[PDB]
Design a binder for this molecule. Sequence first.
Ligand code: NAG
Length: 208
Amino acid sequence: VECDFSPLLSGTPPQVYNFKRLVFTNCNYNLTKLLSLFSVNDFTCSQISPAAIASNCYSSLILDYFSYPLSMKSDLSVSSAGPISQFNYKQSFSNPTCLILATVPHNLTTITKPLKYSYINKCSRLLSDDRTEVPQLVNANQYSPCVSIVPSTVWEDGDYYRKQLSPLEGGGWLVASGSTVAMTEQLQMGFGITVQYGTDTNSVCPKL
Ligand SMILES: *[C@@H]1O[C@H](CO)[C@@H](O)[C@H](O)[C@H]1NC(C)=O
């Protein structure tokens, strides 16, 4: 009983390409309890609504969280190119999702700020001909192929990262570049919620 959103409130939220995932089964949630702590700037859903998501019974609820600057709001949509959706973070297009952009108030103190926001501006793979570059896109619910070579913080805007690939990996080179955005007065964050419905497995219910 009782879903635990605590880990979200303790410490420094990772950068978008290192999003932390909290998984819930068999428990009871109060979503509007959690959002009461933040100033909520944006809240959009897919195949569900902000009202419905705060009040439905699911077989599973997944909550991704990460530091994210409000200024890159538009880059979250799969429409566009956008480094974010292509190389950093992508929600399921099959299951009902929600995305929330929130600022953390001064009076919320247990959440510490990083030096800046970092993201991956490019993730690509150079073929054997040493000419052709093939983008390495992030899949839903997965991390970037490049998370192994990109550090948790981008040191300097424009930094490049390369890895030589073994023949088991198909050969060639993995190439990534990182970008930075300056930290804001109050930290800004993103929350990705994904829900699933079952037949009898709908044990994630709002508390009454
Ligand atoms: C859930 O939390 C919100 C926080 O604003 C509160 O208003 C509401 O009464 C709570 N609901 C239940 C059933 O605890």
